[PDB]
C-alpha cells in the first residue's frame, strides 16, 4: 500500500484515534475515529480494507474486553462493524493467510486464551480452529509462506520465550525453537525469510533487543537493538523496512517511531506520532 495506519491505543485510557503516516513525505493525517475506544487490539489489511480486531476499552465508565471486528474503508473514511469473535480478546495477535484473518489468544478478564479463530470476509463469519499449545496474551503473530506463527506472550502465570507454528492444511500447531529472550507484548512481523520479535517485557524490564527466526535454519539471532526500550509497541513492514510505533518504556508512553533497515542493520528515528501511546493496532494500505 502507501500509508502506515495506527488505530486505537492507550494513554491514561483506551483511545479511538485512527491516524495515517506517509513515509514518502513525513505527513500524518487524522482519520475517522474508531466507534469504540480500544487498546490492546491488532490491525491487519485484507483486500485493501483495514481491520481492527479485539482489544479492551479501559475507560472511566469501566473496563470492557472486546470481541469486535471493525472494518475501515480508506475510500469512504468510514468504519463498519463486522461479525464479532466467539470471545473477547484483549492483547490479541492477528495474522492474514489467503485472505482470512486469524485471531490468536488474548484475554477476557482473568481468562487467558489458547483458542484461535479465523474470519472469512466473503462470508462475514468467524470459525474456531485448533487452539494453540499454550495460552498466550500479549502474543505477537506473523505469517510467512502461508504458515502462522505465535510468539511469546503471557500464559496467565509466566511470560514466555516460547513460540509455535500453525499448519493450516493439518489444522495443527507445533512448537518451534524458543526465542533467546522472554517477551510479552513484543512487536512481531516478517521480513524476507525471518520472523522478527522486537521489544516487549521480560518480567523485569521493557526491552530494546530484537531477534529474528530464520524458518529454514530454525534458529533465532539477535540483530541491532532499537534506540528505545518499548513494550506494547505496534509494528509493521513498509518497503522492506520494519517500523515500530509507540509503546511504553517504563517511564513514558512513547511517541517515537523507529525504522529498521535490514541491509545496514541499523535503526533510525523517522517520525513522532502526534501523541505518545501504547497498545496500538498497525497495518499498511492505500491512502484515503
Ligand atoms: C508494569 O508492569 C507491566 C505489566 C504488564 C505489562 C507491562 N509492560 N510493561 N510493563 C508492564
UniProtKB/Swiss-Prot annotation:
One GO CC term on file: centriolar satellite
Entry keyword set: Cytoplasm, Kelch repeat, Nucleus, Repeat, S-nitrosylation, Thioether bond, Ubl conjugation, Ubl conjugation pathway
First and last residues of every Kelch repeat: 3-48, 49-99, 100-146, 147-193, 195-240, 241-287
Record text about domains: The Kelch repeats mediate interaction with NFE2L2/NRF2, BPTF and PGAM5. KEAP1 contains reactive cysteine residues that act as sensors for endogenously produced and exogenously encountered small molecules, which react with sulfhydryl groups and modify the cysteine sensors, leading to impair ability of the BCR(KEAP1) complex to ubiquitinate target proteins.
Subunit structure comment from the entry: Component of the BCR(KEAP1) E3 ubiquitin ligase complex, at least composed of 2 molecules of CUL3, 2 molecules of KEAP1, and RBX1. Interacts with NFE2L2/NRF2; the interaction is direct. Forms a ternary complex with NFE2L2/NRF2 and PGAM5. Interacts with (phosphorylated) SQSTM1/p62; the interaction is direct and inactivates the BCR(KEAP1) complex by sequestering it in inclusion bodies, promoting its degradation. Interacts with NFE2L1. Interacts with BPTF and PTMA. Interacts with MAP1LC3B. Interacts indirectly with ENC1. Interacts with SESN1 and SESN2. Interacts with HSP90AA1 and HSP90AB1.
Function: Substrate-specific adapter of a BCR (BTB-CUL3-RBX1) E3 ubiquitin ligase complex that regulates the response to oxidative stress by targeting NFE2L2/NRF2 for ubiquitination. KEAP1 acts as a key sensor of oxidative and electrophilic stress: in normal conditions, the BCR(KEAP1) complex mediates ubiquitination and degradation of NFE2L2/NRF2, a transcription factor regulating expression of many cytoprotective genes.
Record-stated family: Belongs to the KEAP1 family.
The protein's name: Kelch-like ECH-associated protein 1
Organism for this UniProt entry: Mus musculus (Mouse)
Range within the parent protein: 325 to 612 of 624
